[PDB]
C-alpha cells in the first residue's frame, strides 16, 4: 500500500531506495518534477508475482510511504491483476490506512 | 609565509601597535634597560587593561611579571567587594581561559606564568568578575562573540563556533545532562590545530577553562533543570518526557 500524510499529500518523494533494495527487482519507479515543483513519482509498479514479501521495501523507506498491509486475501483470476500500478497502490492505502497506522503505531518503537 | 609573500605578494611584516611603538625608545634608551624589567623570558613593561568588577577600572602600564594581586588593588582601587569577594579573572582577554580565585592568588602576570597556569597573557585585557555575577553567562556571551566574528572560511570554526554557541546557551539554562560537558570538551579539542587561523583556539580555550574550573557550577544548573521539568534532559536540550510527548528522539540522546 502507498500511504499519505494527514494533509492528503502522498508521502512518497521518489528516492528509489525501495527500488534499489528489492531482492527480486519487483519495483519499477519513474519520477520527475510535478507541476508545483515537488519531487513525486510518475510511475509506481509492483509485480506481485515477482515479490517475495520480505518487507525490505518498507524497512528502507525514510517517510513510511510503502508498507505491507495485513491483507492476505486477494487471490485474483488473471495475473494481469497482479501488476499493481500507482493508481492501485494508492487506492489500497486509502482503503487500509487505519489498520496501517495502527500496525505502525505498535511496531515503530522496535523499528 | 608573509615575510616572503605578504601584502600584494611582496615581503611584509605585521606587528602590533604597542610592539612597534616601543621600538624607538628601546633603541634610544637601550635594550639592556628594557631587559632590566621582567623575568628571564618576560622582559619589559606592558600596558594592562583592568576592566570588569573593580572599583576603578582603567588602563596603566606596568612591569611584566607583576603579580596579579599586586596590580588590581594598587593601580585600580581594588576589586569591588574586597579580595575575598573575587571569583574569577580572565587574564589576557576573551581568548585566554578563565582563572579562579585560588589560582590567581599567587599568579604573576607574564607570558610564562600564565602559560604555565593553562592560560595566557594575550594582550593583558584583565577582565575581573565578582562573586555576585553569573560566570557561565559571561562565557556564553563570549562564545556568542566568537560565533559572530568567525570569517566562515574553514569547517571547524564556521560550523564549530555556532555549535558551541548553541551548547553554551543550553548550559546557561541547564538544559542538558552532565555527559554533554564531556562532549563539549572534545568538540573543542576537535577545533584546535585543525583550523587555518588561531580564531579556532580563540573560542575553544574559553570553554575549556570554564569546564576545567566551573564544572560543579554547570552540573548544578543541570540538576536544577532536571529537578524542575521532572528528569534529566536528553542530550540536546529536549526534556525527559520528549518521547512520551511524541517527538523525534533517537536512541542515545
Amino acid at each position: 500500500a502507498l500511504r499519505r500524510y494527514p494533509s492528503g499529500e502522498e508521502r512518497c518523494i521518489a528516492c528509489k531506495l525501495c527500488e534499489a533494495v528489492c531482492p527480486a527487482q519487483a519495483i519499477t519507479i519513474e519520477a520527475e518534477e510535478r507541476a508545483d515543483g515537488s519531487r513525486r513519482t510518475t510511475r509506481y509498479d509492483i509485480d506481485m508475482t515477482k515479490c517475495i514479501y520480505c518487507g525490505f521495501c518498507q524497512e528502507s523507506c525514510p517517510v513510511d510511504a510503502i508498507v505491507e498491509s495485513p491483507n492476505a486475501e486477494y487471490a485474483t483470476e488473471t495475473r494481469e491483476e497482479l501488476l499493481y500500478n500507482k493508481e492501485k497502490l494508492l487506492a489500497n492505502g486509502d482503503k487500509w490506512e487505519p489498520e496501517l497506522a495502527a500496525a505502525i503505531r505498535a511496531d515503530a518503537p522496535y523499528r | 609565509f608573509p615575510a616572503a609573500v605578504g601584502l600584494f605578494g611582496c615581503p611584509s611584516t605585521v606587528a602590533n601597535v604597542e610592539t612597534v611603538s616601543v621600538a624607538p625608545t628601546i633603541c634610544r634608551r637601550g635594550g639592556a634597560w628594557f631587559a632590566s624589567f621582567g623575568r628571564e623570558r618576560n622582559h619589559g613593561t606592558k600596558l594592562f587593561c583592568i576592566s570588569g568588577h573593580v572599583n576603578n577600572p582603567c588602563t596603566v602600564e606596568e612591569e611584566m611579571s607583576i603579580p596579579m594581586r599586586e596590580l588590581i588593588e594598587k593601580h585600580c582601587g581594588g576589586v569591588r567587594g574586597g579580595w575575598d569577594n573575587l571569583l574569577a579573572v580572565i587574564p589576557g582577554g576573551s581568548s585566554t581561559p578563565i582563572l579562579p580565585k585560588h589560582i590567581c592568588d599567587d599568579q604573576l602576570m607574564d607570558f610564562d606564568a600564565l602559560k604555565d597556569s593553562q592560560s595566557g597573557l594575550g594582550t593583558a585585557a584583565v577582565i575581573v568578575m565578582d562573586k555576585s555575577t553569573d560566570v557561565v553567562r559571561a562565557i556564553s556571551r563570549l562564545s556568542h562573540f566568537y560565533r559572530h566574528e568567525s570569517c566562515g572560511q574553514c569547517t571547524p570554526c564556521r560550523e564549530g563556533s555556532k555549535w558551541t554557541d548553541q551548547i553554551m546557551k543550553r548550559f546557561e539554562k541547564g538544559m542538558g545532562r552532565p555527559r554533554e560537558i564531556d562532549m563539549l570538551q572534545e568538540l573543542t579539542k576537535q577545533v584546535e590545530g585543525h583550523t587555518i587561523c588561531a580564531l579556532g583556539e580563540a573560542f575553544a580555550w574559553p570553554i575549556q577553562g570554564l569546564i576545567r574550573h566551573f564544572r560543579p557550577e554547570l552540573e548544578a544548573r543541570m540538576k536544577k533543570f532536571a529537578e524542575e521539568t521532572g528528569g534529566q534532559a536528553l542530550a540536546g536540550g529536549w526534556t525527559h518526557d520528549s518521547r512520551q510527548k511524541g517527538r523525534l528522539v533517537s536512541p542515545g540522546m
Binding site: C15, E30, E33 | C151, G152, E159, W163, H194, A235
Partner: protein
C-alpha cells in the same frame, strides 16, 4: 627537480614545488578531500586533508603543503583518524537531512567519505535547530538547494578562473556565509553547467535532470561529443532506451574534465522530433512508407532522371560520421559523380585550403600546444562560441603566463584580453606586418588560429595564402621540428573527417553543373542556392528539420548516441563513439542505408559488414585506423603548394569577416529540438534568473504550477 619523500613508509618521487596531496596520489595513497580539485586553485577551507607530518606540532593541510626533500608523512596515524572524524562531524552538524530528496544521492562525496572516515552516528541534537538558508535564482540550467552547501568554494573558483565569469561569489560571514550572486542574476557562461559536476554536494543541480534518475540505475558509455569540432570525451548515462544525462570524462589532450553547456543539455533534443520511419512526399504531403518501397522510389526516380556525370550531388551535414562518408563517397563514385559538397556556405565549391596535405586544414600545434603558446593571433573566430572548452584553455594559459592575443575579425565578448587589429583582409596584412607581427616573429611557439569561418569567407583564398606565406617566411619559429604555428579550427565534428577521406568538390567544373538529384546526408544548414528547386531530394537523417521539410524521400538514420561512428576532431585525432542505446523505430544505421540503396541502383558497394567498411577507410587514410591518437604530418612543408601556389591570384573584394554563430544555443538540429536550449536562449534574451522560467514549479505568477518544460 625531483624531491624524494616517504608517505606511510613508501618512497615517492615527486617534482619539487608540488603539493603533498599530489605526491600522496602518486604514491598510491587515498587522501579524503572536498575543496581540493586537480584543475582548480588550492583552497585550504574543508580541512578534510589534514595529515601528520614529522616535525610539525599541528596536522597540516596536505593539499596546500609543498613537498620537501625529506619529510615523513603518516596518513593513518591516530592523529589523522581523530582529525578526519572531527571534520566529518562538523561538516554534518548543519547539513540538511535531504538525502532521499537530493539528486547527489548515491554519488555523493560527503556520503562516501562519511562512510569511510567519519563516525557511524551523529552527536548533533540541538533544540535550537540547524542552519537554513533561502534558495537562489542563478539562471535556468542550475537548480539550487543551498542548505546543502559545505563551503568548498569549488564553483566560485571555477566560475572566476576557468569560465572567466565572476558573478558567483560568497557574501556574508561565519555560519551565515552564502554562495550566490548578491543580486539575482542569470549565470551567463557557456561553461556554467560544469559547476553542477564540480559541486561535491547537490546544492548545485541541473534543472533538466531534476529528479528523473538515481546514479546506480544508469548504464555508463564512454563516447564522444559531436556537437562541436573538438571531439570532447564524455560519459552518456542512460536508463534503458532513454539517455538521461551527459557528463564530462577526462582527456587532457582535448577537453580536460570540462564540457560546454550545449554538449551537456542538448541530449533532451534526442527524444523530440525524431525520424522513425521512411517518408515519401505524395501530392505535397509526407506519407509513411516501408523501406522496400521507399528505396524503390529512390531507384525509380533515379532511373527516370538518368543523370549524367556529376549530376548526382551529395551534401554532408555536420554530425555525419566518417563511415557513411566513405560509403556515400563510393556510391557517388559508382554513379559518375564527384559532386561531394558540405553543409556550410561555400561548401559546394572547392576550399581555399586543400585536402592534399593533412596539415593544410588541421589544428597542427595540437590542442595541447596552447599550454605552451606565447603569442596567438585569432583570425575569423569567436572561440568562446565556436570552441568553448578550447577558449577556456587559452585563458588558463593567459592567466598564468605572458601570453599575447590578437584577433582579426568581428569583436566578441572575450574571457581574456585581446588586441583587436581589424575585421577584413587588409587588417590582416597590416597586422601581420605590424606591431603584433614581431610578437609572432619574436615569441617562441607562436600560434595562428584560423577559424573555419574564413573558409566560407569569399576572400579565403587570399586569407589562406596571406597566413601561410607569413608562416613560410617565418619558419624555424613557426615550422620547427616539434612545433607548427599554423592551426585551422573546425566547429563541426564532421569537417576534419570529410577532408581526411577527400569528401570535397575537386574542381570548378563539377561545381557549376546543375544537379537533378541531391542526397542531403544529414545536411540541414545548406544554403538554398546549393539545392536547385526542381531537383530530386533525398534526406537521410535523424531529426525532422529543414532538410526533411524539402525532401522528396525521408530516410531515418541513427543519432550519434546509437551508432559507433568514427569522427575526427579539429586536431586530427580519430576517436570512436560507443552506442549507448539502440535504434528507435524503423531507423537504420546510416552507412547501411547507403549500402542498401546500392542494390536498388544496381551498383552494390562491396563491403557489407562494418569491419569491411573500416578496411576501406584504411585504404583512403591509414590514420583512420589509429584510434585516440593524432598521427603527425610528415610533409608539413608541402602545404605551401595548396595554400600559396594554388592561391596566388586572388580576387580580393574587401568584405569584412563575418560571425558564424548567431546563437550558440541553436547551432544544429539536436540543439534546435532541445527544450533546454529553448529556455537557455529565452533566459539569455530576457535576462531571467528564475530557475522555473519555462519549467515546472510554483511562481509568484504561477501559484498553481505548470507542466510544460521548455515553454
Amino acid at each position: 627537480a625531483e624531491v624524494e619523500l616517504t608517505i606511510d613508509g613508501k618512497k615517492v618521487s615527486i617534482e619539487a614545488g608540488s603539493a603533498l596531496i599530489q605526491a600522496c596520489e602518486k604514491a598510491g595513497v587515498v587522501v579524503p578531500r572536498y575543496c581540493y580539485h586537480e584543475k582548480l586553485a588550492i583552497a585550504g577551507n574543508c580541512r578534510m586533508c589534514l595529515v601528520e607530518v614529522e616535525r610539525s606540532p599541528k596536522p597540516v593541510a596536505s593539499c596546500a603543503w609543498p613537498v620537501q626533500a625529506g619529510m615523513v608523512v603518516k596518513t593513518n596515524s591516530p592523529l589523522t583518524h581523530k582529525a578526519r572524524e572531527g571534520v566529518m562531524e562538523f561538516l554534518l552538524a548543519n547539513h540538511p537531512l535531504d538525502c532521499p530528496i537530493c539528486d547527489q544521492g548515491g554519488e555523493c562525496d560527503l556520503q562516501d567519505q562519511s562512510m569511510r572516515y567519519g563516525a557511524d552516528r551523529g552527536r548533533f541534537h540541538e533544540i535550537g535547530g540547524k542552519r537554513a538558508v533561502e534558495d537562489k535564482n542563478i539562471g535556468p540550467l542550475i537548480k539550487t538547494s543551498m542548505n546543502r552547501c559545505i563551503h568548498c568554494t569549488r564553483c566560485v573558483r571555477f566560475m572566476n578562473d576557468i569560465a572567466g565569469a565572476p558573478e558567483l561569489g560568497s557574501t556574508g560571514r561565519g555560519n551565515d556565509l552564502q554562495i550566490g550572486t548578491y543580486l539575482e542574476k542569470n549565470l551567463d557562461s557557456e561553461l556554467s553547467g560544469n559547476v553542477i559536476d564540480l559541486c561535491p554536494v547537490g546544492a548545485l543541480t541541473s534543472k533538466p535532470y531534476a529528479f528523473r534518475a538515481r546514479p546506480w540505475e544508469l548504464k555508463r558509455t564512454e563516447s564522444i561529443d559531436v556537437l562541436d569540432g573538438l571531439g570532447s570525451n564524455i560519459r552518456v548515462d542512460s536508463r534503458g532506451l532513454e539517455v538521461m544525462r551527459i557528463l564530462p570524462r577526462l582527456n587532457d589532450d582535448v577537453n580536460e574534465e570540462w564540457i560546454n553547456d550545449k554538449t551537456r543539455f542538448a541530449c533532451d533534443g534526442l527524444k523530440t522530433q525524431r525520424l522513425t520511419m521512411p517518408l515519401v512526399r505524395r501530392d505535397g504531403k509526407f506519407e509513411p512508407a516501408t523501406w522496400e518501397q521507399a528505396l524503390t522510389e529512390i531507384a525509380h526516380a533515379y532511373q527516370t532522371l538518368a543523370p549524367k556525370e556529376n549530376e548526382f550531388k551529395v551534401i554532408a551535414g555536420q554530425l555525419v560520421e566518417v563511415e557513411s562518408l566513405v560509403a556515400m563517397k563510393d556510391l557517388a563514385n559508382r554513379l559518375g559523380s564527384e559532386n561531394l559538397a558540405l553543409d556550410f556556405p561555400g561548401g559546394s565549391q572547392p576550399l581555399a585550403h586543400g585536402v592534399d596535405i593533412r596539415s593544410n586544414y588541421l589544428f597542427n600545434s595540437k590542442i595541447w600546444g596552447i599550454e605552451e603558446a606565447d603569442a596567438i593571433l585569432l583570425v575569423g573566430t569567436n572561440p568562446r562560441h565556436e570552441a568553448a572548452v578550447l577558449n577556456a584553455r587559452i585563458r588558463k594559459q593567459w592567466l598564468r603566463s605572458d601570453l599575447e592575443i590578437a584577433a582579426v575579425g568581428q569583436p566578441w565578448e572575450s574571457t581574456f584580453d585581446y588586441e583587436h587589429l581589424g575585421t577584413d583582409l587588409a587588417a590582416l596584412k597590416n597586422a601581420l606586418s605590424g606591431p603584433f607581427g614581431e610578437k609572432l616573429k619574436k615569441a617562441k611557439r607562436p600560434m595562428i588560429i584560423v577559424g573555419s569561418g574564413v573558409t566560407e569567407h569569399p576572400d579565403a583564398k587570399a586569407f589562406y595564402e596571406t597566413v601561410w606565406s607569413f608562416v613560410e617566411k617565418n619558419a624555424s619559429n613557426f615550422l620547427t621540428e616539434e612545433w607548427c604555428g599554423y592551426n585551422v579550427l573546425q566547429r563541426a565534428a564532421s569537417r576534419a573527417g570529410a577532408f581526411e577521406v577527400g569528401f570535397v568538390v575537386p574542381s570548378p567544373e563539377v561545381a557549376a553543373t546543375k544537379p537533378k538529384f541531391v542526397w542531403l546526408l544529414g545536411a540541414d544548414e545548406f544554403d538554398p542556392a546549393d539545392v536547385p528547386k526542381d531537383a530530386f531530394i533525398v534526406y537521410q537523417g535523424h531529426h525532422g528539420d529543414r532538410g526533411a521539410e524539402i525532401a522528396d524521400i525521408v530516410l531515418p538514420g541513427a543519432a550519434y548516441t546509437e551508432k559507433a561512428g568514427t569522427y575526427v576532431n579539429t586536431e586530427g585525432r580519430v576517436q570512436m563513439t560507443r552506442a549507448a542505446t539502440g535504434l528507435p523505430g524503423a531507423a537504420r544505421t546510416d552507412w547501411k542505408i547507403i549500402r542498401a540503396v546500392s542494390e536498388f541502383l544496381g551498383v552494390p558497394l562491396p563491403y557489407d559488414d562494418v569491419a569491411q567498411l573500416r578496411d576501406r577507410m584504411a585504404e583512403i587514410s591509414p590514420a583512420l585506423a589509429a584510434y585516440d591518437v593524432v598521427e603527425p604530418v610528415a610533409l608539413r612543408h608541402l602545404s605551401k603548394v595548396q595554400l600559396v601556389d594554388q592561391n596566388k591570384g586572388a580576387k580580393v573584394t574587401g568584405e569584412p569577416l563575418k560571425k558564424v554563430v548567431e546563437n550558440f544555443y541553436f547551432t544544429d538540429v539536436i540543439s534546435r529540438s532541445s527544450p533546454t536550449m529553448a529556455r537557455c536562449s529565452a533566459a539569455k534574451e530576457t535576462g531571467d534568473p528564475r530557475t522555473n522560467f519555462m519549467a515546472p514549479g510554483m511562481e509568484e505568477d504561477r501559484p498553481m504550477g505548470q507542466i510544460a518544460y521548455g515553454a
